[PDB]
Amino acid sequence: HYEEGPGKNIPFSVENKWRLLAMMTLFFGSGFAAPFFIVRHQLLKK
Amino acid sequence: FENRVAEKQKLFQEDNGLPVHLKGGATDNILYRVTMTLCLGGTLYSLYCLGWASFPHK
Amino acid sequence: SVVKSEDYALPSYVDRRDYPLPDVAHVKNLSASQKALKEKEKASWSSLSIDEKVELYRLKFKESFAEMNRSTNEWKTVVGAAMFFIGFTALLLIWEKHYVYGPIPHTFEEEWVAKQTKRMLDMKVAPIQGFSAKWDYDKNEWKK
Amino acid sequence: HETDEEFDARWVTYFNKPDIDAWELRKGMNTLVGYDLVPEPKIIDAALRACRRLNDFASAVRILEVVKDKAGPHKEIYPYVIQELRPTLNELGISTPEELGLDKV
Amino acid sequence: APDFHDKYGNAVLASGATFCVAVWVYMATQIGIEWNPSPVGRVTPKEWR
Amino acid sequence: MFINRWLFSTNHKDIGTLYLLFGAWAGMVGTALSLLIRAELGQPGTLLGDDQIYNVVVTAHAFVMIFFMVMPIMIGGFGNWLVPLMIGAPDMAFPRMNNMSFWLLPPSFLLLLASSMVEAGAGTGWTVYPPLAGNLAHAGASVDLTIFSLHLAGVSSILGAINFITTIINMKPPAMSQYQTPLFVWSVMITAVLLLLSLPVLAAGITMLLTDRNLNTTFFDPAGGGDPILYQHLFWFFGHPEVYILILPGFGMISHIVTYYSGKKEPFGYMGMVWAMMSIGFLGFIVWAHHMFTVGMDVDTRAYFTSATMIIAIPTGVKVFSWLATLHGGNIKWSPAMMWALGFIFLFTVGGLTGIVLANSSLDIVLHDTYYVVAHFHYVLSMGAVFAIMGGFVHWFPLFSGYTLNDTWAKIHFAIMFVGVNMTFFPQHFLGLSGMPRRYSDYPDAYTMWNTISSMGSFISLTAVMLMVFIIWEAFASKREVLTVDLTTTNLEWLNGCPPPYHTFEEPTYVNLK
Amino acid sequence: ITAKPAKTPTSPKEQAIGLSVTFLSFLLPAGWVLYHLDNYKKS
Amino acid sequence: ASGGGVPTDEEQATGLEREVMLAARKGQDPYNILAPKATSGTKEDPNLVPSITNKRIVGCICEEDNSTVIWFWLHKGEAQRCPSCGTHYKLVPHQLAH
Amino acid sequence: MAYPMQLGFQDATSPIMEELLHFHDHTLMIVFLISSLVLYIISLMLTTKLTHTSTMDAQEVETIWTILPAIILILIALPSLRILYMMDEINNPSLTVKTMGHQWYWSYEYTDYEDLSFDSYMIPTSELKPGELRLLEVDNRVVLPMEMTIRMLVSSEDVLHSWAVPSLGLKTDAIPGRLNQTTLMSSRPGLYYGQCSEICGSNHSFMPIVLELVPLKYFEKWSASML
Amino acid sequence: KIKNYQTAPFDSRFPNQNQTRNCWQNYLDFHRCEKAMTAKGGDVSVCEWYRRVYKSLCPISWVSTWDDRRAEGTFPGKI
Amino acid sequence: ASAAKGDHGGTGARTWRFLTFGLALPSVALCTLNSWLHSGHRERPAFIPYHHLRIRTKPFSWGDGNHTFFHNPRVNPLPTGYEK
Amino acid sequence: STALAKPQMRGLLARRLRFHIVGAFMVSLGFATFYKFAVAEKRKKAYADFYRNYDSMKDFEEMRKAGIFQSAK
Amino acid sequence: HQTHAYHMVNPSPWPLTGALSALLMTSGLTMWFHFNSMTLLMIGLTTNMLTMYQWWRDVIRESTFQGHHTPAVQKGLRYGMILFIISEVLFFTGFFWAFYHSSLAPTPELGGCWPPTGIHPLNPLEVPLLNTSVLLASGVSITWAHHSLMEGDRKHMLQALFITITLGVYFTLLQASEYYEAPFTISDGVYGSTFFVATGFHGLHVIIGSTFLIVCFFRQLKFHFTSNHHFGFEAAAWYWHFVDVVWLFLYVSIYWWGS
Ligand code: HEA
Ligand SMILES: CCCCC/C=C\C/C=C\C/C=C\C/C=C\CCCC(=O)O[C@H](COC(=O)CCCCCCCCCCCCCCCCC)COP(=O)(O)OCCN
Ligand SMILES: CCCCC/C=C/C/C=C/CCCCCCCC(=O)O[C@H](COC(=O)CCCCCCCCCCCCCCC)COP(=O)(O)OCC[N+](C)(C)C
Ligand SMILES: CCCCCC/C=C\CCCCCCCCCC(=O)O[C@H](COC(=O)CCCCCCCCCCCCCCC)COP(=O)(O)OC[C@@H](O)CO
Ligand SMILES: CCCCCCCCCCO[C@@H]1O[C@H](CO)[C@@H](O[C@H]2O[C@H](CO)[C@@H](O)[C@H](O)[C@H]2O)[C@H](O)[C@H]1O
Ligand code: CUA
Ligand SMILES: [Cu+2]
Ligand SMILES: [Mg+2]
Ligand code: NA
Ligand SMILES: [Zn+2]
């Protein structure tokens, strides 16, 4: 069937906490960085 | 016309583990691949159209 | 003793001053001397020693009331760490002033503000309570 | 509902049931402590004697701790209740949580 | 046995409070922030016209 | 297997997890936009550009926080995880349609980020009023991309509302009446009826805006006999129900959290709480023109909308006093979720009370389109909907994941966030009463002190959001697995363990009639 | 609630690393954009 | 005015629908469509709770019109009591190879 | 105008604005008192180890929870609606002035007698004269006679704007195709400032309003000289 | 009656904040009057009250656009 | 109303067929006649370039940008009048 | 030795609630008295005292002489 | 093995392909209106059509062929369809509100009158009354079809359903002819705007309802319906009555009262 239990009912791995840290840093960091880069884009056009 | 619903009931209840959207046989896989290809390819094309449209043109 | 994830649907032990007699004993498996102690508990309790009585209590329950209700030093960690991170915030604010913000407008220069203050008093800005009401137009100074 | 004496008498009767079982002892005490009151000595006496019929010394001690707990900051209530129970404590050989060191944090 | 709070709680409280006060006083007073307080009792009005 | 499970899901818990991850990512976008607003305003002068880039950031801030963070987390995330468990149902009524309500949201968010990248963005306000949002003052694709983002988010939520109403009415145990369902299930049913009736009126209004911009209709253009004020009525006929949709599932989570950490088997006054949520939902459809007290309506209309808006305080008050009556006599457990819920009770009450100030139209003449309104709604949204979300997230995180958070870090996080949001928003009341307008990239010098403090507050809240991410990482990194949870006899969603198996209630509960 | 001790304990030093990486993930890219705003603005 | 040619459910229903329809004709409720009627709930006359596995969740609405439902797992073996009202329930496992 | 560190409303320049300030004082105490009462019960509910966890009867206390709020709301709505119908009362203006909003400045038309009209733009910060207020001054002020009831009619020739003067209690939206009316009466001479109050694009923050209130005979000569 | 015109008086037909129809109605009344007068040989000076009232109330661009449309033959009100 | 017809007893296909052929389709046939009578060539009004009609704030996304989607040359003038 | 007296054992939470809901109300009345007095009454009297002998032409002439007006020198 | 009566649906790709088809349709309309191109839009319409077809095909497989629509599942789908129709009623209410807002207070630009100066409405006693007779007749024939199906009469169910569809198609061809004949257009101010957007969305729903009736017609030809289980037919009938009721409000409001 599918895996059941803690750490297995999620679409991301938690088997290694440092690979997890990297994935979480990329995921939440990309959402928070996006509006700054959109502002940079709107400033650089005109 | 003749009532052939029993034949379709036997087809779709065959114990073959197929999910319903592929249980009619090979034509279902073909239609699924067409649909998913047009959706994923169209989504990439839409992203390309955003990249294009995100910058002023000459 | 040891509680297992696969026990989740079974009656469980809890120390709760509002649920004093929980649904199971804290220890169910008994050693030979623990079995002998539960047999002795069928006879008069005056014949139990203080240690046997404490042992019977700790088979039935995990923590006493005094233990499960004890206060802790956790508030010092919470309030201290929250002050630390609020203090860390002011580093971010210092960095933003230094590297992000440019100079503010020239209307904040001291001479501008002294002139602007005089003109607000000349047009009697907020003369009932808010601003010019606090100036003494007879003595030409701020009201004490 | 009823007068205070009728409430007390219903609880004394509940615990005094000769063949009260362990489930009923626990249900009774865990229900009783939901109320806004510290149970009178006579209710506690009948619960302690139900612990005796059930050969359960530890639950007798826990009931004495929950009397103290329900009094909150009213520190005069528990010593009064232990006072009134002393004859039953001595007769049944029930040590108090303090005599057992179980009031230490 | 003492836990993290019994062993480190006093020092986290003291050091976090000290650090927080010091950095906010510095930020508020030493780096050129314009709070724009009220001129009342503070500014001597000057001829503008 | 990964694609079948996470892209082709028909399972309410996994779809709920997808919504919580989407809502958390949106919350970081919305937080960054909130800090760009407060960086522009944290000293006098211009930081970024003029009001166009500024109000593109303000517009996107609101749409992201409302449609991509609060609604997906409260209804898609906690609604899907908890409603079927709280009624013993094996899934939602339409488990495959539920997955399309989720997958419509990444495309809707893509449209909104495309609106900000093309041309000069949609610098319109989240209300998107014409003619500023029309094709002369906002020529080019940005406002059309915003309208389409809202159409996709509206379809997602309308189909979600049909799913929730059907599931809650039809899939309870046959002995359970709707007066034996938990308060959070009622809060989701009522929110879903508000969504079902309000979103179609917004879709009508923004479609009219789309045809005035692209098909030469003139619904809102006086040159064709149209009227900009008709758009405002259609928008706010949805927009007032929308704020009750934002808060109602919050009220349902608060009722559970307060009851649980008071050690109570039930909330005080359950039928009053159901009546109060139904009354707030009904009255929330007859008050919308309190957003229009300066547009020039007749005096008797302005009297009726002042009165009808104030009346909502009666049932709202019943819920506040009933949460206080649920704490009364409790064995209070000072868990971090309880702190969030107690912060919610007091900060929601402050913001409801400044809502009552604003309901007085003659005073709203002076307060409308000033920061007093911004302060009102951020005390009910940043300190009400967000604090209900954080309370429910820390309370139910061990159910969803099987792991516990560190409660000391969670209390530290609540302390920092409470200081931050109050520093940010309390001074905005002074700015509004003294006349600072909304949607301004800079202000007359007199307003500098309170804008500086408010911006400093916003950085404290940023530190709290960063720490929240570390706290979630620490829980998954340490893997402290849950063993026993208290009060399962009155909190059925826990009774299948943590996390519950992929299929629960394959054998339904047994409930007799008696 | 009760729970097992951590299966993979995260020591104070490991928490300091996760906390520092998490804060830098939000602060560095935004800090880089805001540091360079004058560069984007004056062309 | 009228003729035939439309299948009936007796003829053509299948799968779970057909199981539910055949069981109902027998007055049986293997798929839990009806609410069970309580017994007096004493230890001599416990509510009998059918199951296909070793334990099932019970919800007890202890008094009529209570809004709070008390939930617990009932396991195979000796009758258990609702922790709020004490009314008795006993698991009766087995089948669906029924 | 607002002044630094201000907490409440600008001082009232018109009798209606005075009425709003007392009505706000009345309402804010209620806000105070309820917010304080809530916080104080909250804290009473959370500061005892006594407990009572069994089912509590709700009906008596819900009567108090509904009726005392309903009475408080009537004690706010009664003065609130007196003021609303007072501002709407017929008053007989002596002058009508129109203002049209534009991106990004206001025009004014005083056409009771002659066709007087002009534009009014913010003074750029780099051109302020010493002592003048950043973002608030305009080149051509809206001169008006003090102690006289004036009808202001407000509209727009482009997108929405909103014409506000807080110290007179005024904010009327400027909508193209619509002519909205308000009344203005200043009890005092002076300079009374406001700012565009509906988002209107790139320079929404930078199109302020400055009324200059003077005796009628000065207003008359000013008007003639502006033709 | 009325010289010493100061401004347009209160008109019970238009007692609310939206005064657009007051401006429009006076503009129509003026021009309807002037057409009746220019026709039947009589004097446009009798139409003067409507003229003062619409000049007081109406934005100059509205009057200017309505006058251009009357000249163009595209004015949509009935005169 | 009870309308003017009249029958019940527990309900039916025969009655609904009777209503479809005996009332509904006759009414459609009568209206189809009534419409046939009044069909064809009405007389198009003088063109007047009214500014509240023939609106063009953005060109249409088809054709030359100036023709409506189901433009009928006979009766839909452009902003500059009727076509050749 | 002496026995201890029987203390009150019942309704202690209700008794505490009764006592403090009264103290909270008594206080709301005391704060309303200070609030009327320190803010609302003070405002009324500031406006009445300001306008009692206010001379608007004298105010105008002061402003005019200070050079603040475009329309009056 | 479950022992409740509800349907656990197999994992499916159609929700994702439907969401993507919505991204492609809306980014496609944006390309069409701003970048002069129909490409993305036809890809999105095609994938939306494929998605609709395979999703509803699978609902027929799940019910008629696999038996998962027990009475409790059918009751859910009843509530779902009713709630969907209520949302569509509220969508039309927005357009009705717009129509009455602009017609009850006509602005000076219109001539201060309704219909505006320069607008010559259609005569409501000509093709509009015909269309009204057509959709009312089709509500009668759709009721005959329903009773025939309940009485087990295949031939007359098909005959009445074919008549119902034929009338839906008649109304759609008559409306298309009226749109081409009308002397005013969607660009003819707020009269043309309200008229064509409100009747145009109604015409789209008549096309959707007619398609749904045609799906039921081919399923009936394939014997899928029993005399007691035929929720697709019931839902299409309820939707068809909704399309007729909306038409009666349009006829009275826009064509008759607004003429
Ligand atoms: C979660 C969101 C939320 C919620 C719950 C509310 C709740 C309310 N709001 Fe708010 N509001 C917004 C979000 C919300 N608001 C937003 C986003 C805007 C701005 C929209 C924009 O322009 O962008 C806004 C704007 C808005 C306006 C328009 C202001 C203007 O633009 O000029 C008004 C006017 O009436 C209003 C009033 C109210 C009222 C009366 C309530 C009430 O429902 C509150 C009732 C609660 C209480 C009253 C507290 C509890 C009660 C007691 C403890 C009882 C004792 C109390 C009394 C006797 C009064 N709000
Ligand atoms: C028999 C009726 C069926 C309609 C057939 C025509 C094709 C479009 C199909 C959809 C119809 C729905 C309404 C959309 C809006 C406008 C079309 C209105 C009906 C119509 O067809 O109006 C025609 C104009 O179409 C135009 O502009 C056409 C522009 C076509 C582009 C449509 C725009 C995209 C629409 C956006 C829809 C958003 C959906 C909202 C979802 C809500 C989510 C909850 C009228 O022709 P005319 O030449 O102006 O005048 C007649 C003169 N002889
Ligand atoms: C802006 C407007 C603001 C309005 C605010 C008004 C606040 C109202 C004040 C409330 C006072 C009225 C209720 C008094 C009870 C207080 C709590 C308490 O007293 O706990 C118990 C009462 O609860 C019982 O039974 C009765 C049922 C349970 C108790 C019901 C208590 C009501 C809840 C109190 C709410 C507190 C929060 C108020 C929020 C403002 C005390 O038990 P008893 O001795 O009665 O019975 C014991 C049984 N014997 C006698 C038979 C032995
Ligand atoms: C012009 C093109 C662009 C617009 C797109 C739309 C185009 C046309 C779509 C036409 C709608 C076709 C729906 C076909 C549904 C077939 C599946 C079906 O009917 O499934 C039935 C279940 O109903 C069900 O799910 C009920 C499912 C009903 C939903 C449909 C209602 C309309 C949805 C339309 C989208 C609206 C757009 C609104 C625009 C503003 C199956 O159960 P039974 O019938 O009981 O059978 C079982 C018996 O055999 C057992 O004995
Ligand atoms: C609102 C959300 C953000 C709020 C606060 C952000 C706090 C800042 C974290 C630091 O960000 C970095 O700051 C450096 C400066 O300290 C920048 O280096 C810049 O400056 C250095 C010193 O001048 C040079 O060595 C570098 O090359 C040059 O990139 C670097 O780019 C940027 O990542
Ligand atoms: Cu003009 Cu804002
Ligand atoms: Cu509202
Ligand atoms: Mg506004
Ligand atoms: Na700024
Ligand atoms: Zn029970």
Residue numbers in the entry:
A (entry chain L): 2 to 47
B (entry chain J): 1 to 58
C (entry chain D): 4 to 147
D (entry chain E): 5 to 109
E (entry chain K): 6 to 54
F (entry chain A): 1 to 514
G (entry chain M): 1 to 43
H (entry chain F): 1 to 98
Reported in the publication:
Effects of decreasing the azide concentration on the X-ray structure of the azide derivatives were analyzed for investigation of the mechanism of the two-step binding of azide to CcO revealed by spectroscopic analyses. The terminal binding of two azide ions simultaneously to Fea3 and CuB was observed also at 2 mm azide and the occupancies of the two terminally-bound azide ions are identical to each other irrespective of the azide concentration down to concentrations that are insufficient to saturate the two terminal binding sites.
